């Protein structure tokens, strides 16, 4: 009943699943550690060689598979990698979100970490989809994380090109391959973005709870072609699904360029902390306290803000908080950064507001900057964008992702 290959056992009837083409995974054993075991043709018939060395360049980083050991002996090739809960795909059809706070948030932030840490080796990864993130048993303290798994189809580049030739192999997996990698007329050679775009997909794929912004399997990939895609579970005057949508919306463009790299999807507010979110506010507050109004900054801040204050902001918050504004008042309502301006002034002087006041507000940080961007969904989305201009700036640099 059990089988045995070296430092590596496995009872073949613990089936945890297959890969493609006589690839099976079982669960087993190795040293004292649960693994899981997949079995491969030999290298004639594999040529697997290179992506298993890829995958233990790669697997220092907690957010890469860790891998273990592979083992020869039989007819087939062993490879032992950690054991884990589920796929995200599992995690996503399987798993109640109403008792998961933030986790599905957190998910998507170690994939991203994961997926920088591949970049930052020049491994582009080209086949990322919620099935080959896997999520991990729970440590010692009931956390889990997700890892990026299935080298089967990374390239290195070499260290002089940034793309690659798309007739190099499978495409990837239907339903997640960036358009570049299929479409007829195609002039620029797929790079790196691709993961994103495929990241861009998987992101929703959590968010929505098991939906793709190209439609359902039969449709996704020509979708993906057409460029017809659609965000609908992302309500358009909701804080979070503004901020989402405008970061999924970016990477899933059809043009690879414009797309955001790993790094610059880790620095999007999508995965700020409240408290984050509002010393964002304050850091943007005071860095247009004195800026002048005809300025670049100020300006850029200012177009289509009418529609971001609603018209007149002080007619659209609670009546305690407006009256602690007219003790010294003079406030534009149609100003972005007049909006701002009232909110870093009742946080910084949040110890001193009337109790009616702080009660309105909410605790600071939490429920302070919540009061503000549930009243207000395309502020910080708004103000995230316009304050580009500053993204080169020390002062910024927690915010956005520049060289
Ligand atoms: O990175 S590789 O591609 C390195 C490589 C590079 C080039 C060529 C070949 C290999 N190897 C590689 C890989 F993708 C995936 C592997 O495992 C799987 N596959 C398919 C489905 C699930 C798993 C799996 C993995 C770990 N835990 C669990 N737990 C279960 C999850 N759901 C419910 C319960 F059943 C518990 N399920 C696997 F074992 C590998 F080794």
């Not at 043709?41 to 992506?51: G, I, N, T, Y």
């Not at 895609?229 to 949508?245: F, G, M, N, T, W």
């Not at 309502?333 to 946080?347: E, H, Q």
Request: glycine fraction near 6%.
């Amino acid at each position: 009943s059990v089988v045995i290959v070296g430092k590596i056992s496995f009872c073949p009837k613990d089936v945890l699943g297959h890969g493609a083409e006589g690839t099976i995974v079982y669960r087993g054993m190795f040293d004292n550690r649960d693994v899981a075991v997949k079995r491969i043709l030999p290298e004639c018939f594999s040529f697997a060689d290179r992506e298993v060395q890829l995958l233990r360049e790669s697997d220092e980083h907690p957010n890469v598979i860790r891998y273990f050991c592979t083992e020869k002996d039989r007819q087939f090739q062993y490879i032992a990698i950690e054991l884990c809960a589920a796929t995200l795909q599992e995690y996503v059809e399987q798993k109640d979100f109403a008792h998961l706070g933030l986790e599905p948030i957190t998910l998507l932030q170690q994939t991203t970490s994961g997926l920088a840490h591949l970049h930052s080796l020049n491994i582009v990864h080209r086949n990322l989809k919620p099935h080959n993130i896997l999520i991990s048993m729970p440590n010692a303290h009931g956390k889990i994380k997700a890892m990026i798994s299935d080298f089967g189809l990374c390239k290195k580049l070499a260290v002089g090109r940034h793309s690659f030739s798309r007739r190099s192999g499978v495409p990837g997996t239907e339903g997640w391959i960036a358009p570049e990698m299929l479409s007829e007329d195609c002039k620029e050679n797929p790079t790196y973005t691709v993961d994103i775009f495929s990241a861009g997909c998987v992101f929703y794929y959590v968010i929505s709870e098991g939906s793709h912004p190209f439609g359902k399997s039969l449709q996704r990939q020509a979708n993906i072609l057409l460029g017809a895609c659609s965000l609908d579970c992302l309500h358009p005057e909701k804080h979070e699904d503004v901020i989402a949508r405008e970061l999924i919306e970016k990477m899933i463009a059809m043009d690879p360029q414009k797309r955001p790299s790993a790094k610059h999807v880790l620095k999007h507010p999508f995965f700020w902390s409240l408290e984050k979110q509002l010393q964002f506010f304050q850091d943007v507050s005071d860095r247009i306290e004195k800026e002048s109004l005809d300025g670049p900054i100020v300006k850029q801040l200012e177009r289509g803000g009418r529609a971001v204050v609603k018209m007149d902001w002080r007619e659209n918050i609670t009546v305690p908080l407006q009256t602690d504004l007219r003790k010294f008042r003079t406030y534009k309502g149609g100003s972005v950064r007049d909006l701002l301006r009232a909110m870093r002034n009742k946080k910084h002087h949040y110890r001193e507001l009337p109790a009616e006041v702080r009660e309105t507000l909410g605790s600071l940080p939490d429920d302070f900057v919540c009061y503000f961007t549930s009243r207000f969904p395309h502020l910080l989305a708004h103000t995230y964008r316009a304050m580009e201009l500053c993204s080169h700036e020390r002062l910024f640099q927690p915010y956005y992702f520049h060289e």
